[PDB]
Amino acid sequence: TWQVKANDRKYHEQSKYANNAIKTYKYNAFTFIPMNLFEQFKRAANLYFLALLILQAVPQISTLAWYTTLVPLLVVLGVTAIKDLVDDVARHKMDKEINNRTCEVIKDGRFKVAKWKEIQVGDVIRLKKNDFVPADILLLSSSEPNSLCYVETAELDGETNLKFKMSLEITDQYLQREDTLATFDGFIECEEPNNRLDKFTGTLFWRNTSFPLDADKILLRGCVIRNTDFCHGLVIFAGADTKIMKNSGKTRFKRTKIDYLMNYMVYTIFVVLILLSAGLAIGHAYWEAQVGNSSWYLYDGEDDTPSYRGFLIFWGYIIVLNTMVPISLYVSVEVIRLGQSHFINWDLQMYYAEKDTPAKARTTTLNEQLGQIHYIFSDKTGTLTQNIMTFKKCCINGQIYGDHRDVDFSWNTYADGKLAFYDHYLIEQIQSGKEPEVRQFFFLLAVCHTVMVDRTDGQLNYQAASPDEGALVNAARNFGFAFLARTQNTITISELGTERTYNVLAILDFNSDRKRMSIIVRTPEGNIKLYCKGADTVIYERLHRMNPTKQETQDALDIFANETLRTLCLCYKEIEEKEFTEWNKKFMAASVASTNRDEALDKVYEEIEKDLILLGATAIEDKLQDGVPETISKLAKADIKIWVLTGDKKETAENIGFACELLTEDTTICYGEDINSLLHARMENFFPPGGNRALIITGSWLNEILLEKRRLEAKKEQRQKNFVDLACECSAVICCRVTPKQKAMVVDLVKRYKKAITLAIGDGANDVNMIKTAHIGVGISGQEGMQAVMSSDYSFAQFRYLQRLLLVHGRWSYIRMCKFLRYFFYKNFAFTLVHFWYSFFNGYSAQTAYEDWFITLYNVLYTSLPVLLMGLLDQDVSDKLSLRFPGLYIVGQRDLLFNYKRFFVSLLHGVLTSMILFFIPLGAYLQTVGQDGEAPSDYQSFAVTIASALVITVNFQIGLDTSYWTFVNAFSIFGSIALYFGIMFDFTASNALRQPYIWLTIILTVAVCLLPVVAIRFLSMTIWPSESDKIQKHR
Amino acid sequence: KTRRPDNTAFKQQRLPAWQPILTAGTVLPIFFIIGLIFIPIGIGIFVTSNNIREIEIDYTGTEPSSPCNKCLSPDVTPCFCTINFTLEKSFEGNVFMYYGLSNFYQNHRRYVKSRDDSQLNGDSSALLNPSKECEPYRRNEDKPIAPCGAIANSMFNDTLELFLIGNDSYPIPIALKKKGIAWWTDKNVKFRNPPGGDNLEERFKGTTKPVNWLKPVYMLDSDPDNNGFINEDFIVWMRTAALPTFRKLYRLIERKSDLHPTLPAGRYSLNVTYNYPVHYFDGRKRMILSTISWMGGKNPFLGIAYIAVGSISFLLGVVLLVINHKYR
């Protein structure tokens, strides 16, 4: 059990306590270079090229120079190494800033300044207003009565509203002063460190008495102390034990599905490479036995048995056929990846003008995975919504206002200008004062609330625990009725610029079941009013007969509910003098603990709020980000399922779900109670909710549903799969009140039990764990912390830009990458397999069919640029057509462009091209090429003929593959051929290409390689046209 | 974050471009124009190749009952054979005399590399220091081999002569030019004698002959312009071949001054000095006489290949046309 001793730095120094310093970086200044263990082992290609470099080093077994393998290998390793270095160096800066944060500590006798690193468990600290909490501390005292404190848990959940916290009663009345804190010695036996944020189990042993502790007395590390001058607490969990850091996952190396596929494709190529080389090695051993040993012209000394001769070339043929997996493929992928990522940054349609922030591809490796997405997990506050909650409409008395009929707000000074009210009739009525209902309506908003004033630098800023009250009180200020300030016994409000101090005599509280609030305020004249406010259902249950506005407001509430506006009914009463005085004695008697204080308070509360007269109803708007409902529908047409994981309340999460149109009137909402019955039913036995189409679960229900010995592990494995199976067959899933770690476990659950590619989008530290867990992590810009942005792969400002990231950049990047991979293998299998066929005509001696200077420059000059441009400038359809037809995105979801079938078809294409490229020149030379004194039929001419036919064929193939023929694309395809035929015409080899037969052989070889392809490509689209083909055909 | 991205066609992915689509109006014709060009080309090559008079004589002497089997076991090193052949049709124009070798892997990796191109280029430093590349024939016993390597050592060294058996039965030797049988670049650029001196004897001082050569490289030919590394026969051999079955140019028979055929049809006898042993590895020596043609040599393969590929394009063109019409 965790034990904490106050003001004792050496109580448990007798390691298990973690110092308050954090460590998120991965590489030190020494263990950075050993990252090669990560680069080499994870990707088998890097190991293969390392084997080649070692293999080509030994002169005994060599056929190609090694300087052409080291330089590209350093580029492949270098670029990835620098990318990880800059990312990790950035993580060092974040840790340094957090660690170097300043605080105050009870050192010996006094409060002396210290950094966040120097904080340790059992350390008493003092925190001022607007200071970050440095560790999980037990609140002891504060600057305001009852040691009452407020915190902004923006990192635990994305909400900004203040959270209410208290301290122990005994500690409140003794630890107010610094001197008593210095000598404070309290022993705490609390729970072990954990990631649960809403629960805390512990007791404070102090003054020979035990006092239980709850979550309402513990301030966590991600909190910000607000609206309180100072507070004191002793650290309990520090550094890595803090619940925020337990709610944080590791930064993994994220790589794309295609990256994993290439590993499996490359494994097969190794098997063929060993089998081809071994088969040719065996043939040489046989050939050396029969023909080689009896060939006097081949004698070379160094008598080697044919078995040894066969052994040596096995490594020779490994080097000859090394480009079956070419290093140029991975050097070129990085160029493709970097270019595709800069198109996200350069996008003017993903650039937010007013905030002046473009998109940023913070990870350049995952471009083609944006075209693979199956699930999107998104935050609510700040991601789907703007986090702005304004007062839109009100049914004052009987009439409905805020209808743009006939604002400057200059008539009142307190008007900040945040409100965008357009109706002018309401403003006229307020100033006119003809109807007293209008004055009382906004007076109630400025009275019945728990909102709190700041009054900092002459600004009348408001802070509230409930955003609804904060919006209503802000609106009341704009309409003259400004809530100036409140003391314990009175509340001061400016009625149209006139100071008026009301002495409140009783403040009714708000509860989840109560669903309302009221307040008894005595006007200065002497009258007593019960200003009430709450939900429509509970309020109407406590009306009286004479109310003639029951029907009019009921219709107004329906109108407000139609446009998804949160509503509250307003009421007032006219308590007499003696009636309250008799009841005040009863109410005061109910304030004591007595037995429970819950039943007594509920009983007296119900009698208080009888016979209420209505003033109207309000309609608050929780603004959605622009283009959110249009984006959610658009991404749904791409068969992308969007789950909303939010740290907010269920009521607000569901309301935004309707506004986003994730939930509709057709959807039937399944709650946590409904799910548990079904999951249990399947356990004791596709789900019936397949037609229900909605699922709203709280973080508490997630723990029970996930249930977080050998048989127990099986139940854990089974229960998780059952929930994921049920949840995935729902149109919308909204998870509310989930911790940052619960956000990630939901992403991980879909990743494991569905093999789906997941995208996590959000803002703030709440979403960093799922941003780090998902295959693609997007950070919405706007938070000054920039914590979700910094941990994200991509980062733009508006949710609506998810359309262009997925349907344009992700869709194209998948097409361009798959096209690049399929061609790059073809052009190298068609190139390196000519040596395989020539082995049968040279004694399996590992002699190459090309000149040495052609083997080096093939992938460098003659076939390099055209595929890079096709991998950067190829578009099947324009951006406008990409967004008009989201159904094109499904092509990448199902992996229809790169597969085992598609990869092996490119090997068959390459194997047949190399077969044709060798055996037509062979036939044309076995008998007679144009033969005279100045003639080919040499080995140089044979190598020139295949190289010329190979360069033209592969460069013509990329022309067929290319669908976006820019001038740069055209120049490179014909420029690559023109460069090959320019280098070998003095800017021997040129001699072959001046003969009619040498050019007739090349023309024949090219056509036999290309014409069957043109037929198949045309035949493929005519009987099996693709979605892109139909759009382009009908374009 | 930063300022607005600048608006350019490349950066906004809106470069002016052309979107080709494989329509029936574009692929159907090329499958017919290609077929219409590959058929006449195939006929043109095929007919011209058949119009070449060529006689090939295999004097390896492996089979018994042949008048050259005595040289397979040369008790006396100088061996001679006489092969009688007849030309039904007289040859016309220039006639090239090749020698053919079969099952002779001149494209072996262990063999193609066995040379010192620097020494052949006429490098004094490399003349006495042949590279390790020609390791097996670097130095004979004490001093370096001038034509180092297995390629130069195993040089074809049979002497072939042609005699015309006239009506009088008296053989008529036919003039055979041994010049101009190598590439112009080979003679004047790639292959050169070592610098300095005027006599080839002095230039090649302190350099032994190859092991298998009977006489040094000094007197490969009496003509000073055809001896040394610039010797035509030596140059033709060192220019390696691509496949085991190959033929190399040996002699030139220029056009006769008179209008009569260069080799009038009749009786001919090949007098060959059997020196090169090839029967150890089942090789077969040959002698080829061919007549020049303006359209290259005699290649029946290409002509047939164009006919096949040219005809298949029509089949694909018709099949694609028929398939389109069904799915139009």
Ligand SMILES: CCCCCCCC/C=C/CCCCCCCC(=O)O[C@H](COC(=O)CCCCCCCCCCCCCCC)COP(=O)(O)OC[C@H](N)C(=O)O
């Ligand atoms: C007249 C008009 C002509 C216009 C076009 C002409 C072409 C000009 C092309 C220019 C771009 C060159 C691109 C080079 C790609 C690298 C391929 C490669 O790597 O080929 C390694 C050898 O490459 C090297 O020697 C070093 C390359 C450094 C690359 C520099 C950075 C990237 C430049 C990007 C340029 C971007 C340009 C702007 C883009 C908008 C051999 O692969 P490999 O053979 O598979 O294996 C051999 C075998 N394993 C072994 O052990 O021997």
Ligand SMILES: *[C@@H]1O[C@H](CO)[C@@H](O[C@@H]2O[C@H](CO)[C@@H](O[C@@H]3O[C@H](CO)[C@@H](O)[C@H](O)[C@@H]3O)[C@H](O)[C@H]2NC(C)=O)[C@H](O)[C@H]1NC(C)=O
């Ligand atoms: C024509 O070329 C052939 C090679 O194909 C020559 O035959 C080779 O002759 C050399 C000698 O000059 C042989 O090397 C050694 O000869 C000594 C005798 O001096 C002998 O004792 C060794 O055992 C060894 O054979 C070489 O073996 C031999 N080649 C073969 C395949 O047997 C031939 O001499 C050349 N003739 C002319 C006229 O140029």
Ligand SMILES: *[C@@H]1O[C@H](CO)[C@@H](O)[C@H](O)[C@H]1NC(C)=O
């Ligand atoms: C070939 O000709 C020579 C000389 O004319 C003669 O001795 C020999 O018998 C002839 N052989 C054949 C097979 O005709």
Ligand SMILES: *[C@@H]1O[C@H](CO)[C@@H](O)[C@H](O)[C@H]1NC(C)=O
């Ligand atoms: C063939 O040539 C050799 C050498 O040049 C010569 O001695 C012989 O008389 C010629 N005629 C034959 C062998 O019939």
Ligand SMILES: [Mg+2]
């Ligand atoms: Mg948020």
